[PDB]
Write a protein that binds this ligand. Structure first.
Ligand SMILES: N[C@@H](CCSC(F)F)C(=O)O
Ligand SMILES: [Zn+2]
Length: 547
């Protein structure tokens, strides 16, 4: 049995979960559920990314401690993920004792190994508030067009880019005071020292083609030392032997993957698994599901950090593209910037899980949630192809045969066609070619419905002496449904539970080899109802009203 540790990117604690986050967590969850179905030891891990200046400043504005704020956001995030049935084995926080000790440990090892450098830099400083200002917290007049109230390194009027130091009449977004250039000693991680190791990993063929291509661009530009320290005031971990200095959030963030797993092991009283998964000689597999905007950190900084601190590196990175709604980036004004919590007020989790899965592939291309297509696809595939197989046949079995299925398969050849497809479909789930798996499953659904139409149970039901035939036909349809729901189990957790209740059996991957014969099924009420555009319109309107 394989040992697998899977993670999803750690959501920032200063924002609600939206459909963008959900694409990633759903993709990983489908993969994880499939791996569990094949009998592997799987540890699905995540946590909130809780450090940084943005978080510190937000807490101060709300008039509460950063700890209180991140605690409330952690609860909000977990409630949303639970609503979508993302099956984490542990959801922790980067702001934890586990992460603090691991961050200090890794830093100490990197420093001891000569990978940490000291360097003085100049940066905008708020003398009133008494804090260095990241670019986004510096505002002023654009040097080019002279437009007032511009933020950071760019003007939203003429579109010019520039260093905040070029801003005319600079002002702190925090206090409004005029910022000044101030010196400060910073600690840097020597990423360049790992260039050759990283280049070898890029050409190993493990990473997605598009990712490797991107990495070549970064090597061409040239790797640079990475500033991993920030001055107080800051919400994060203090650097050992360096009063007033903290670890930059991105240094401790990925270590949070380790911290969350350590936390899980510690809670389980498991004293051996952490090392079995993170030591250099590990035989366990480590996978990170991430978006394209954070590939640099995960493919370059992260593996280098682990290498330099004597830990194993990721087995692979699974990158996905952005989520668009109706073909465009989510838009607050159009009501397409949809929160996970809002989605659940209008639709169930299975619908979105299915739609995303039907569109996902092993590539990093963007995934589009076309709302019109969403309604059409869910109704056509879930309600009319899969669930229909159960709903059109269960009635006769329950009313005419006391809920008992036939003692033999009416069409063994057809059933074999269905079970024979397990290898290819499982390989599709395994390789993350989700769209392919769904297409294969729906092709089978079409054959199943063709079979029922060919047999015409609604005709056989009204013909005297055809009772045995009716039971045979309907039982066959229900067994085909059993197989289809097994292949879709990683995708539709709730519908699967309802299906298992109806079938009076847990669905296992190998179980399809034994059809349900002379078996009692239970009556059920609507396994899955149709949706309509009026609900989509309501979702959009509700989303507009929020912002
Ligand atoms: N919070 C980051 C992802 C961190 S993933 C790992 F490094 F912690 C983000 O939302 O981009
Ligand atoms: Zn301008």
């Amino acid at each position: 049995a394989k040992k697998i540790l899977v993670t999803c990117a750690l959501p920032y604690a200063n924002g609600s979960i939206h459909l963008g986050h959900m694409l990633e967590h759903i993709q990983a969850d489908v993969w994880v559920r499939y791996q569990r179905m094949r009998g592997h030891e799987v540890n699905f891990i995540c946590a909130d990314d809780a450090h940084g200046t943005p978080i510190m400043l937000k807490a101060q504005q709300l008039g509460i401690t950063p700890e209180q704020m991140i605690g409330e956001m952690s609860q909000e995030h977990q409630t949303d993920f639970a609503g979508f049935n993302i099956s984490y084995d542990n959801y922790h926080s980067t702001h934890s004792e586990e992460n603090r000790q691991l961050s200090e440990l890794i830093y100490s090892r990197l420093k001891e190994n000569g990978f940490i450098k000291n360097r003085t830099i100049s940066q905008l400083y708020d003398p009133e508030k008494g804090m260095f200002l990241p670019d986004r917290f510096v505002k002023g007049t654009c040097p080019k067009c002279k437009s007032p109230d511009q933020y950071g390194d760019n003007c939203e009027v003429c579109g010019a880019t520039y260093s905040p130091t070029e801003l005319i009449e600079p002002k702190s977004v925090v206090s409004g005071a005029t910022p000044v250039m101030r010196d400060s000693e910073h600690f840097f991680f020597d990423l360049p020292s790992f260039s050759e190791m990283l280049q070898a990993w890029t050409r190993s063929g493990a990473l997605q083609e598009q990712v490797a291509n991107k990495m070549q661009e970064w090597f061409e530009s040239g790797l640079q030392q990475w500033d991993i320290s920030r001055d107080a005031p800051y919400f994060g971990f203090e650097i050992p032997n360096a009063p007033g200095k903290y670890f930059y959030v991105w240094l401790d963030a990925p270590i949070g993957y380790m911290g969350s797993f350590k936390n899980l092991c510690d809670k389980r009283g498991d004293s051996v698994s952490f090392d079995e998964y993170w030591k250099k000689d590990s035989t366990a597999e480590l996978y990170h599901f991430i978006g394209k905007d954070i590939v640099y950190f995960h493919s370059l900084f992260w593996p280098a950090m682990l290498e330099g601190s004597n830990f194993r590196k990721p087995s692979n990175l699974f990158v996905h593209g952005y989520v668009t709604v109706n073909g465009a980036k989510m838009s607050k004004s159009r009501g397409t910037f949809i929160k996970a919590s809002t989605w659940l007020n209008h639709f169930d989790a299975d619908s979105l899980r299915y739609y995303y899965t039907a569109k996902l592939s092993s590539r990093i291309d963007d995934i589009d949630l076309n709302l019109e297509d969403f309604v059409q696809r869910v109704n056509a595939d879930i309600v009319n192809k899969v669930v229909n197989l159960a709903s059109r046949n269960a009635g006769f079995i329950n009313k005419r045969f006391d809920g008992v299925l036939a003692s033999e398969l009416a069409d063994p050849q057809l059933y074999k066609t269905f079970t024979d497809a397990a290898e290819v479909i499982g390989e599709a789930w395994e390789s993350r070619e989700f769209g392919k798996a769904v297409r294969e499953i729906m092709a089978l659904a079409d054959l199943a419905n063709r079979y029922v139409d060919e047999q015409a149970p609604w005709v056989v039901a009204k013909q005297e002496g055809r009772d045995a035939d009716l039971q045979a036909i309907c039982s066959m349809g229900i067994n085909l449904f059993r197989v289809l729901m097994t292949y879709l189990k990683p995708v539709l957790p709730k519908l699967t539970e309802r299906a298992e209740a109806f079938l009076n059996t847990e669905l296992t991957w190998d179980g399809i080899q034994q059809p349900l014969l002379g078996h009692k099924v239970n009556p059920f009420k609507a396994l899955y109802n149709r949706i309509d555009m009026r609900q989509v319109e309501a979702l959009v309107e509700a989303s507009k009203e929020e912002v």
